[PDB]
Amino acid sequence: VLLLDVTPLSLGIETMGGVMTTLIAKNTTIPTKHSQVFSTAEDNQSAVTIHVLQGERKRAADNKSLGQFNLDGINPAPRGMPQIEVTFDIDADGILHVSAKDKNSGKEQKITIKASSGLNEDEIQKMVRDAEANAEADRKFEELVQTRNQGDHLLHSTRKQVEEAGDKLPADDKTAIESALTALETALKGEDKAAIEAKMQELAQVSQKLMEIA
């Protein structure tokens, strides 16, 4: 055949740290359906926000928002535990159905997005061009977010571990850990990946006894 219908740009959702994660790649023939299981970004979350995105950039804010919805009623649990199945299905008339369902609670939400939604032909060409011209900066942003998400989880794990080790943790180590936490939290806000990793290292250095308690 010399012609067929595709979805012209990648579709997916925003994940922890403001990244676009793709569920359906650009130029995939329609109809088509793809699912992926996600979890929660922090301990004790009872909801997730599904922000639907069209485009080829790694920063979620640089793609086109198609809409969003919340999935609520998740039993609060340790980060990474809930299994949230997200499904994107585009039918033959180009209408996109996105759903998310929490396996444990059985709660589900969805949205329907009309086929005329999203970017037009010139914006599609520009999105492809801009992704190409900014490829190196986007890979660097993805690397930074990976390191921020690890630093963020180490910040929360450490505070939890300080808690679990009440008085067992010497007073002076608590003080040193707390200062290193502050420094890590500051580095996470910046955009220098090595600086964040360096603060995680410095925190590991004062956490030796904290680790022994575990």
Partner: peptide, 7 residues
């Protein structure tokens, strides 16, 4: 690893 969603 598994990707994560905020609240």
């Amino acid at each position: 690893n598994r990707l994560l969603l905020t609240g």
